[PDB]
Design a protein around this ligand. Sequence first.
Ligand SMILES: Cc1cc2nc3c(=O)[nH]c(=O)nc-3n(C[C@H](O)[C@H](O)[C@H](O)COP(=O)(O)OP(=O)(O)OC[C@H]3O[C@@H](n4cnc5c(N)ncnc54)[C@H](O)[C@@H]3O)c2cc1C
Ligand code: SF4
Ligand code: F3S
Ligand code: FES
Lengths: 577, 243, 130, 119
Amino acid sequence: MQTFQADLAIVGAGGAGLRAAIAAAQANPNAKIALISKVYPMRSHTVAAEGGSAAVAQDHDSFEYHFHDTVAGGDWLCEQDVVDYFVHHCPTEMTQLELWGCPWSRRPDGSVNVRRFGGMKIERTWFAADKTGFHMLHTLFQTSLQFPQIQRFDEHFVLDILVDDGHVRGLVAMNMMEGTLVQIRANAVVMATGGAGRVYRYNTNGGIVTGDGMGMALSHGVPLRDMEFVQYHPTGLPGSGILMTQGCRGEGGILVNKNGYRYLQDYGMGPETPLGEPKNKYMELGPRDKVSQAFWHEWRKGNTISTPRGDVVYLDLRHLGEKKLHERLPFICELAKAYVGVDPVKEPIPVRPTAHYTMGGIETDQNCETRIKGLFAVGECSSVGLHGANRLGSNSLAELVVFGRLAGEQATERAATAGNGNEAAIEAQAAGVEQRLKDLVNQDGGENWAKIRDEMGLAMEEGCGIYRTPELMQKTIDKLAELQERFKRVRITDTSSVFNTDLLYTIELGHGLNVAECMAHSAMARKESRGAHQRLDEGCTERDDVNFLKHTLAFRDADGTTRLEYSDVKITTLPPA
Amino acid sequence: AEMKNLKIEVVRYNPEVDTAPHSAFYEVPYDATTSLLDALGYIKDNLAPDLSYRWSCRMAICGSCGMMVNNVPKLACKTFLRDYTDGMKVEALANFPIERDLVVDMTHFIESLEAIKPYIIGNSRTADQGTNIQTPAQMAKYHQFSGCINCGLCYAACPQFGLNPEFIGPAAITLAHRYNEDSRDHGKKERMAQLNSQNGVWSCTFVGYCSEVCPKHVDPAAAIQQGKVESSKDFLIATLKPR
Amino acid sequence: TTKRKPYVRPMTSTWWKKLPFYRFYMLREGTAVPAVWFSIELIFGLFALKNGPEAWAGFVDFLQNPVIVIINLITLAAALLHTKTWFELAPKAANIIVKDEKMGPEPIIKSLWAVTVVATIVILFVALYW
Amino acid sequence: MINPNPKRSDEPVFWGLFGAGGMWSAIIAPVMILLVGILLPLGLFPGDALSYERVLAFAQSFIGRVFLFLMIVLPLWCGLHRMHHAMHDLKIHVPAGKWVFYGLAAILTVVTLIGVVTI
Ligand SMILES: Cc1cc2nc3c(=O)[nH]c(=O)nc-3n(C[C@H](O)[C@H](O)[C@H](O)COP(=O)(O)OP(=O)(O)OC[C@H]3O[C@@H](n4cnc5c(N)ncnc54)[C@H](O)[C@@H]3O)c2cc1C
Ligand code: SF4
Ligand code: F3S
Ligand code: FES
């Protein structure tokens, strides 16, 4: 194994990872930052966004309002000091992104415009178009090119990290094109591997969002906090799971069942608002969870339209006019026309809820540091305590640059004052990763990894859906344990070395199984209803701040079992009520 | 019901066994919603596990999908089997070296894009002063050219690049123009060097296939022409200076 | 050592024969043949014109070959293609903004073809009516 | 790696000429080919508009001389430029191709110049 020297190494070229590389470069102009990703940085999942990034801007807005919408939206499971830091640092990072060339849409006077997302009362979401995550990822990356401190390792699959005496010392990754392993030494490692929505059969995520960094963090005792809160976005295409942006409803679109009845008024979201004026908080602009759950109820009432790709409801957008449909939203119209064969000017779009965002992630303090000294986690793959039981719309993007910058500067600090460690132990850990890989390659049994992935997606979609019951959740737990036993009988029949996607996808499946078990157990033990976690059995259909005002921590020990602990939630100025 | 089956021909290549690429034939069930990316998923799941390829976002925005469909450069996630009932041949993206199956050596693309210095240069404004002032008018000068997803279809479309591998290429040029026409940038002279090269704007003969195959409608050829204009201005100005 | 063996596909001299778009491009460049042919003829008739009515009459007899009339008809055809594709491609080198939107190419194309028709008319008028 | 300090090209010169030429032949060439290649050697013109006397009279006029020089020379630089690049497009190797095609262009430009100062 060849070895590279780096001050700090980042695992993930997403918005969090790129912003962290930039902040760490600007912090230490003499550092050698090893930025790693299994795809070229412009291929990270962040490109796929259409919503926007939250940042307080309007004069009639305040950091108190953003703080309040975040805490309340999270059902008081947010670390409130972290939320305070976040809302106080959003305008500096969105402004800084504007300075780096990000083409935020403009008011006719030259300032940056904002629109309403996540149900906030005061609009504060900056946007480029319906192409915001695209322009922000490409802006961060193209700005990252100008910093020579950032040695990139594009298309490098980070296999494991190296831990000895409670401090991180580097990581072992595979040169994907070459099929050869590489050691990277660094007294600071930042995890920015993105969420893990690919464990669901139907999701809005890219193929690379397999949550590998989370599983790597599990392998070394770090706990995964609040994994039960999987956020479903509503309106999404069937079969594919491709997002229909909330802007569709934000322009006047309606949700209808099989009877043409705007069903949302029957679930506390009434009265019905006219086709003319859409009102925030009402009808199709109501709370996200209540709209998804409303789909579940309409499915129980048999009011859903049966379709081969699955049961759906209809997003009717006809009442906008030719010019507003074809000309104003180009990417969304092209999307619908392409993937469901429907012209939004002529016909209504078939949509249904879909797995979207991973509120959970690696446990981190207020400076994005985990229980291992020198190891950091930022982005969707982390859990700084900003989202709690439910993340607010357009907040994750702002988290990427704010906490990306923070994680960069802090990682520089920790790498500066690390001291040295036992070399024989570290080389022993690297040799251990090498041997573990050899073991996975020589493993035989004849089981197909793909059917295990499919059955895992079905298990997660069934037991851990919008609504959840103890019988089906226990069923998903037992099914995940069964698939865990079947993963040891998998045989990787592709023995090639140049871009062997077989092996890599298999490893991704392993990480996915571990993380999924953490999710299902974290939910089965949380006997209450909070945010995206919604149960139906007696005694758990409401919010319990007396017994469950606490974070679910999920450990995975060496014996393959998923244990749970609970931590307390930091309150500052907004107590739960 | 019963789904129809389509015979897809894929250009495989294993650099450890094969001397030269070769076709393989796979029957794939499909409907009115089956994309080529989905088809590749099925083939690698049930027919040949050693088929490698690049992909991610599943909705044509990331840009790793690039491949050839009947000698037409397309994104595999924006190509649907319903339109190919009479034969379908999938080769790796054209005018690039084939590393494995449908994966190519994207190195030169990366190198060119880095070489045109794609970032804001010469601005001293700091975050504590607020954002720059830019009108929708000032944005429209370059907005279209920013939606480039670095997918590389245009490099498979341009024939001048297939003849000249040192051609920095349509996408790199278009990005450089995007930063030259940004009202917030003052670093045009830093990229004029690569632009005026014979490997720069002066290697395009205006074939125009790039803008045609562009899945994000960037229109890179127009950026190449405006770049020839700016390069001619630069030439004359550099001539009228004596010494 | 690397187990990579990157395969480079060759690009023949017949790359354009495949796709019709390429064929159209190569034709569009192939218009250069009859245009320079026509300028050669223009030199022919110039020096035949200054060499007296004798040489001039010999030149006009050359134009009546009639295979030369065939070639000149093809010359007019190719030159018309050249006007078409030229007016199509020329507006892309302009970055014009009309009220927050990048305009063209239809107005420019209409203007160019208008100027061309005006030219053709004025030329036939001066050349034939007087 | 790409050259960090590449050689600026002289192309902007020929691309310039090839421009103005192509524009010229775009707007003026078709009617000229109709006049000279079709209408004249077929007698399809009223009276003696295309006879030797009137033609020569137009030629020895100043405007006739200039229009003739442009009508000959501009399409020459244009088309010859296109041929130089088409050589490359066809992978036909031509020694001193630059000097060949553009040299012929300047040759016929001097020739046309000697013709428009009247022989
Ligand atoms: C359609 C859509 C729209 C959205 N819109 C919004 C919005 O408007 N506002 C908002 O706030 N949020 C939005 N989100 C959510 C939010 O943007 C995402 O959580 C965000 O993309 C998270 O990105 P990230 O920085 O965590 O890294 P990601 O973008 O998830 O990328 C993960 C990175 O980790 C790397 N990586 C992963 N595994 C490995 C490995 N094993 N080895 C090496 N590298 C690895 C990848 O290469 C990549 O660089 C949206 C999400 C979707 C799907
Ligand atoms: S412009 Fe179209 S083709 Fe050229 S790179 Fe961006 S996406 Fe690929
Ligand atoms: S097709 Fe090729 S020649 Fe230039 S205009 Fe486009 S890069
Ligand atoms: S799959 Fe990401 S762009 Fe087609």
